[PDB]
């Protein structure tokens, strides 16, 4: 040792050091051979190449934070929408040209190389994909962050679209392994279910247990160009008839939610305290002891009430193992963690029935108890005589089911609980939780989401970063707020047209794919009007067919009048067992292959369903969509992250005052926006009165028409009764409320029609637009996390090499 | 492509790079420090920084056999027992000394890091030792050999004597990952089992099959400096209830061997094929498809009946798949296989019932019976009326079970039988298999077995191969007859000087481990006297307990006979379910606990047991043994590896005139050799007379003491009835005469102890053993089979560099 050291290994991000070390470990990394090698053979190839360059940074990063002994964040999540890392880690390391040049230099092309990648089965949505531009922007801004989770070996499926059908395939992302992690078999850890709890006249005993191993797998994370590589770990179940309980062990990769649930928990507060006492540099030994500090060093970032066992959990150990005083271990508990809610429905919630408690832990069922008790007599001190405040604020919600309310728990143990957008927060505060607000308001935040402008604009869109770079430098990726800079050019005929020259260029590109892929001709200089959202009915892609349909009939009604062309591309998953989803993605298919098959429509209409939207190919469409369809009913959607990688990315929004729209708006102007239909206000006076939607039919012969041909097999002709289903919740089961926001959307619809046909004042637009989306990039929610929540200051410094 | 080559990228064999390498290895490969490595880590980072050095010259070796297209021999064998790989890649490669000097200018110790390699758990004992010495002359004897097994993921259990009893703890090598191989999903074949057969008009089909799949680990294996790097490949077993189901697809690693040997035999054929036709240089395609050059393409060593199923495969394959007609199809199989008897009992060999058969196999046992059927024809045109004889070589035996004998397949089906000694290959035609070797006698063969001078002797004992060295070259190594040039220093004095110091040197350095590791204190001047054997009955290692006890009891009578002194070191491993021999390990710790505790005892007998006898154990015993004690039965022994390692390594052997020793005796001369006992003769005159093993007893007074002392509880006080059942066998039911030898073997102990007194002439007798040694190499072995059986002409040249 001390003549061992990252010394100087890496060398250059020089291409013909970088050209070696491919070789080197095409033949000695996976002992293959240019005889032997295939496209995946040559990625691995280039991957392994790339990884030495992030790994040699992550120790000097890591070494570093036992050094300095910063305050540790563990960001705390069920899921990470993390997608495909190799060009991710190029372009956040600066290594993405000489690759592309020693690449080509080989023989081989790195565009068909990234693509043999598979997208990390790590996430299945928004939440996922927060705490995944979470983990950039922390990196970013210098901060010493953690992402912990479960290592899913098969993630929720791949999606495979057969006879218009959907069809859910196994996500087996990791056939043939994934070479960003390294596996730390020498840190298994142990968590404990079922057992019973005996007590001695020293503490509380959880004994007879059935223990699972938990293994650790590690990945970096760069931040952009600061040479700070941050931690991503992840864990895997290992079972220590015998047979049974082995499957059912492995399977953590209903009761088993609860399981994966306290198992992040568990593992990773093992290595929270392991790491907070042995806090000296070389020194491997526990140096700490005085849990004074513990909030000064670590924070808990809870991301939702999926990881709320942290609180009883980490009450247990300090108050059990490490025999502290309850009500100092719960100063520490409070200190440290922190909720940060993602609904607007209070039917949403978290509430795991007691009797399964009882079972599965029993201690911290003891505990959430005594948590329980010991808040119900603060909130009684304080609103003393009122009994139905405790019977509302309790943790334990009561009757038919006897249940443990997580966002209470979570409310109760932490120092601040923030919602995810200005009106959200407002009504957490108003409505939601208004009585904890009432009871102790100073924790109550707002933290607005934000997106990661590396990820979702200089790496997906390098053309669009190019243009705005040779205006107002490359400070922006940074500090997005440079971004209201481009205001200066809403006039400049040579902005102008580069502006609209990217997007032409990212929809050809576009096109190219699906031609290759899905073998579909559709025409590069048409409307690219996308959604691509989780397919729900509240997310109402039921409105957009409807106004595909308004299209056809129309353009079929007058078969030479002028239309401006649109591609109504759709994309997303059902549920697997979701019944309605189901029949709307195989309406939109059934649509289509009506729409795109008949020559009267000439190339001004296709409607095409982009198969198993993921993080991937969200980064091929928003660089070519023109419209961002945000239509979900007004008071539904609490934020809406994919609203503003299209904002960032120069597509105009077509949507409802809510969620996302609202601050978009007040950014943008709402002269920029295309808000139509119903707000908030107006959904619940419709609510006031009963939604009733044969009047909309009534009244509507162009809605009364489409209704008619679902109803009699036009985009079914086969089996004409296939849509009744959805025709009889329209009709008379639809909570919302299509019927009442169609009118509107399609005069909307026309005017964004109109504003496409005079290309200036469309680009014009979208200036204004991707000048104001500055206030959307996750490096401002970070860093208002940080000041604001964990108590730690942003830097934008560099790391030396 | 063309630039992405293996061209210079291992460089140096330098110190300097060497450490470059491990740097390189332990930051980038294992992602660690000098923070946080631990032993395990820097040995890894050796491991790695060795093995770039190894799969270099695989690859170019690899490709080398593809442009020559030579004929590839499949040593198919279910275990490989290899022991451990750096040290043998190290001096393989020549690059041990700068592994040793880089290390030390890192501040580490090889010999630490070297010792905490596990030994690779695929092999039970002997055989799999037999295959990985083959292993190893194959490669330095140049050809294009593979080695194919079952890559188990615990091996067979580490022995843990607890309490002078034995334990089974679990050999789970594989914790941290192996270095040395590559697993290879890409690879990843079906094997079938159950299903049905239909016959169609085209042929016939076997479907509805369970399907397990075979996923393949690649290991490199290095001749001695010739450059040629050959594979070992191990299938892996992989579940596609299917809880049941997967448990047991994952529990290949009863039905369960049946499945476990059809699953390497189906795994391994379809990569012969594979190979075969996909022969041309740098292209991939099936090229070859015309069958008539296969058996001089393609050998296959069926090592025992375990893999006997490679013959009714191969047909299923060539006539079913490849669609060959029977005729020619056979033609191809017996041309192309040839099988090793390792036996030489007439029940050890495999006979599966055809129940089991029908319904795993059900399409092998089509071809199984057909096979029968055209070879009782055979049988039957060479011998008319001969009716018995159709009877006895029939492959189905009758009788109350119908059973299919697996080595008739291997007989009828290889065009070579052979034994692993003389005696034994000529007991096969004249018993076992006489009504084979009577009908085609032409395949009976012998070859006789040996062990590689590389591991047991430049390896294993680097002072008595510097000494050997320094006087004919370093030729011995690959070409062990020159060692008779030492027969000229017989005379030498400085030799028998220096001869008698390595030893003396290496025993110095063994007990130096024996408390290090063990406690008991060993004499250094002591002869240590050695018997490590599977433990077990026809072994005898009751009769060495018999003659510790009586040396302990005449040092115990006469306190002041000046007596030479004794180590007796006992090891083995004793199969979990045989009561016996786990009596035999607590009978020898039990005299042990006497013995060496007995102040008039003195330091001038200790008894050993020496716990989990493996191959890095016999590498350090092996080295410092005086006598080797290869004491069974006559008659029991076939051949006896083992015996030819103490051999080269300066012991002497006392031992019956049976398998390896006679040989052995016959190259060393009779006077070099303490053989003792009956010979075959005379323990088949003792049975027709009847074995009384009264007799003995009543004639021989120190005997009688010793069972009075066995019954008397005086080995065992506090259990006074322990060993009663160990008498009860010795005393009347002994089938191994140990009484019968016990006078004659106690003889020649005092003949051995005589002449450890006069040391010039032990070590004169000891330059006659090792000079003599050279017939036992295991590269005379394969030459033998590569010339007489495979039809290849070993090589000898060195590959480029
Ligand atoms: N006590 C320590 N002093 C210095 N570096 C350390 C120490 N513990 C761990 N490291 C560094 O942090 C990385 C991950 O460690 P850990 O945070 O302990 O999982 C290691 O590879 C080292 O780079
Ligand atoms: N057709 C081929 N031509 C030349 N080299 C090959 C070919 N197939 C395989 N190899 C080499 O042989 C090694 C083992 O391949 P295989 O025998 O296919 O398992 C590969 O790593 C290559 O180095
Ligand atoms: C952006 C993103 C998202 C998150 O965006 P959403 O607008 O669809 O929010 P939700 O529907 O509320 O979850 C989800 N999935 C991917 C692939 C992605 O890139
Ligand atoms: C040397 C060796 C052996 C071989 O010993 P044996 O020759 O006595 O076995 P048999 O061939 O059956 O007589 C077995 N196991 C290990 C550890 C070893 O190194």
Redesign the interface.
């Known amino acids: 040792?001390?003549?061992?050291?990252?010394?100087g290994?890496?060398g250059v991000e020089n291409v013909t050091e970088l050209?070696?070390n491919?070789?080197?470990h095409?033949?000695?990394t996976?002992?293959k051979?240019?005889?032997?090698?295939?496209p995946?053979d040559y990625y691995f190839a280039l991957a392994h190449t790339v990884?030495?360059h992030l790994?040699?940074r992550?120790?000097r990063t890591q070494?570093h934070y036992?050094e300095k002994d910063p305050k540790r964040i563990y960001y705390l999540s069920l899921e990470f929408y993390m997608g495909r890392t190799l060009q991710n880690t190029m372009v956040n390391l600066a290594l993405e040209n000489a690759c592309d040049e020693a690449t080509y230099?080989?023989?081989l092309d790195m565009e068909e190389l990234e693509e043999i990648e598979e997208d990390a089965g790590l996430g299945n949505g928004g939440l996922g994909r927060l705490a995944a531009c979470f983990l950039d922007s922390m990196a970013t801004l210098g901060l010493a962050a953690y992402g912990y989770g479960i290592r899913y070996e098969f993630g929720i499926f791949n999606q495979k679209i057969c006879g218009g059908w959907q069809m859910e395939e196994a996500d087996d992302w990791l056939?043939?392994?994934n070479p960003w992690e390294?596996a730390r078999?020498?840190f298994t850890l142990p968590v404990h279910f079922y057992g019973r709890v005996e007590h001695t006249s020293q503490g509380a005993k959880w004994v007879d247990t059935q223990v699972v191993l938990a293994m650790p797998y590690?990945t970096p994370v760069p931040g952009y160009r600061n040479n700070v590589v941050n931690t991503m770990r992840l864990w895997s179940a290992k079972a220590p008839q015998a047979?049974?309980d082995?499957?059912l062990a492995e399977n953590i990769s209903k009761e088993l939610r609860l399981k994966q649930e306290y198992f992040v928990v568990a593992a990773t507060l093992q290595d929270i305290i392991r790491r907070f006492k042995s806090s000296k540099?070389?020194c491997?030994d526990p140096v700490r002891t005085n849990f004074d500090a513990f909030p000064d060093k670590v924070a808990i970032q809870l991301n939702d009430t999926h990881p709320s066992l942290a609180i009883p959990e980490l009450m247990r150990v300090l108050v059990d193992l490490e025999r502290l005083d309850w009500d100092k271990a719960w100063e520490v508990t409070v200190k440290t963690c922190a909720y940060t809610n993602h609904t607007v429905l209070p039917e949403a919630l978290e509430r795991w029935p007691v009797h399964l408690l009882e079972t599965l832990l029993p201690r911290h069922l003891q505990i959430i108890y005594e948590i329980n008790q010991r808040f119900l007599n603060r909130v009684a001190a304080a609103f003393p005589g009122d009994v139905d405040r405790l019977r509302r604020m309790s943790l334990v919600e009561e009757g038919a089911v006897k249940r443990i309310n997580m966002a209470h728990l979570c409310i109760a143990g932490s120092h601040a609980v923030n919602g995810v957008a200005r009106i959200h927060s407002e009504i957490l505060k108003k409505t939601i939780f208004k009585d904890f607000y009432e009871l102790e308001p100073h924790k109550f935040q707002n933290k607005t989401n934000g997106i990661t402008p590396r990820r979702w604009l200089v790496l997906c869109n390098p053309g669009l970063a190019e243009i705005i770079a040779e205006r107002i430098g490359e400070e922006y990726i940074s500090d997005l707020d440079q971004l209201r800079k481009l205001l200066s050019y809403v006039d400049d005929e040579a902005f102008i047209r580069d502006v609209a020259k990217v997007k032409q260029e990212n929809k050809l590109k576009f096109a190219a794919y699906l031609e290759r892929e899905y073998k579909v001709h559709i025409n590069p200089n048409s409307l690219f009007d996308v959604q691509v959202k989780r397919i729900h009915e509240y997310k109402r892609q039921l409105l957009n067919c409807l106004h595909v349909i308004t299209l056809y009939n129309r353009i079929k009604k007058e078969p030479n009048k002028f239309v401006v062309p649109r591609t109504v591309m759709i994309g997303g998953k059902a549920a697997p067992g979701y019944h309605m989803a189901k029949m709307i993605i195989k309406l939109i298919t059934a649509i289509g292959d009506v729409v795109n098959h008949d020559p009267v429509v000439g190339d001004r209409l296709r409607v095409i369903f982009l198969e198993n939207y993921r993080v991937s190919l969200a980064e091929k469409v928003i660089p070519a969509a023109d419209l961002s369809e945000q239509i979900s009913t007004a008071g539904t959607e609490a934020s809406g992250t994919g609203n503003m990688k299209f904002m960032l990315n120069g597509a105009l929004t077509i949507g409802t005052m809510d969620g996302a729209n609202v601050e978009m708006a007040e950014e943008a102007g709402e002269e920029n926006f295309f808000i139509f239909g119903m707000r908030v206000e107006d959904v619940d006076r419709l609510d006031q009165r009963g939604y009733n939607a044969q009047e909309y039919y009534d009244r509507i012969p162009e809605l009364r028409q489409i209704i008619e041909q679902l109803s009699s097999g036009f985009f079914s002709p086969k089996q004409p009764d296939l849509f009744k289903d959805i025709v009889n919740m329209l009709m008379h089961h639809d909570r919302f409320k299509v019927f009442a926001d169609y009118e509107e959307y399609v005069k909307c619809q026309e005017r964004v029609s109109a504003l496409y046909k005079n290309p200036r004042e469309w680009t014009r637009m979208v200036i204004r637009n991707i000048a104001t989306s500055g206030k959307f990039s996750s490096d401002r929610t970070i860093a208002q996390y940080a000041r604001e929540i964990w108590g730690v200051e942003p830097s934008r410094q560099r790391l030396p090499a």
């Open positions: 040792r001390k003549q061992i050291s990252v010394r290994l890496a050209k070696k491919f070789n080197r095409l033949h000695f996976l002992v051979d240019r005889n032997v090698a295939t995946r990884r030495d790994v040699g992550w120790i070494q036992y230099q080989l023989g056939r043939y392994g390294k078999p020498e590690d047979v049974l082995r499957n540099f070389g491997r």
